[PDB]
Homo-oligomer: A and B are copies of this chain.
């Protein structure tokens, strides 16, 4: 999914060997196989390492936590809110375009007790999310953050973003987001 070229490597120095060029190619390949970008996921260096080269996996703990899921965000401004004291990495998250019917939206804010009831009505099954995703407001850096049920989360293809992080700003600077990626990043649900 990386395309070709060198070895993508996360560093505080910056994601090694990753160009918006590479981005456009690996995005086009995914689009040709039915995948659609649903937002960003900001995390720290070795966690980025794991996800990209190992895949999104759940944690054999807390199996029944009601709001368990993999969080992402439409605007990297919000995603950017996540990274290590010492500098993280931003990733773009893809799902097959077919699962989009299972993405719901609510105005209540997620992971709060009064949203549980409403969210189960949308999802049509008691939580936690299974192959669903739910978006509701409650970001800060912007409203709107999305939770992916882990079964969906683990079947997404994840790749580095071209938006970089700064060891001085640990919010997000507009000027740093490549305009080519600005284009790639429109949203479905």
Q: Does A14 contact B (CB under 8 A)?
A: no
A142 and B151 form a contact (CB under 8 A): no
B171 and A177 form a contact (CB under 8 A): no
A107 and B182 form a contact (CB under 8 A): no
Chain B residue contacts of A142, Cβ below 8 A = 105-107, 135-137, 144
Chain A 169-189 interface mask (CB, 8 Å, partner B; 1/0): 001101001011011111111
Chain B residue contacts of A97, Cβ below 8 A = 96, 98
Q: How many copies does the complex hold?
A: 4
Sample of 4 more A-B contacts, CB < 8 Å, known A107-B140, A136-B142, A174-B187: A96-B99, A137-B144, A179-B183, A182-B184
11 contacts between A and B (CB under 8 A): A1-B130, A33-B98, A33-B102, A33-B130, A34-B96, A34-B99, A34-B102, A96-B96, A107-B141, A135-B142, A171-B189
Chain B residue contacts of A151, Cβ below 8 A = 1, 157
Q: Taking CB as reference atom, which chain B residue is nearest A180? A: B183
B101 and A33 form a contact (CB under 8 A): yes
Majority-rule SS of A interface residues: loop
Q: Does A86 contact B (CB under 8 A)?
A: no
- With A33-B99, A182-B182, A183-B183 already in contact, the answer to whether A143 and B105 are too (CB < 8 A) is yes
**Distance from A20 Cβ to chain B, minimum over Cβ atoms (Å):** 12
Task: Kindly identify which residue among B99, B107, B188 contacts A139, using a CB–CB cutoff of 8 Å.
Answer: B107
A137 to B96, CA, bound (A): 27
Q: Does A55 contact B (CB under 8 A)?
A: yes
Chain B residue contacts of A139, Cβ below 8 A = 107
Chain B residue contacts of A107, Cβ below 8 A = 109, 137-142
**Distance from A129 Cβ to chain B, minimum over Cβ atoms (Å):** 11
Q: Taking CB as reference atom, which chain B residue is nearest A172? A: B189
Q: Does A127 contact B (CB under 8 A)?
A: no
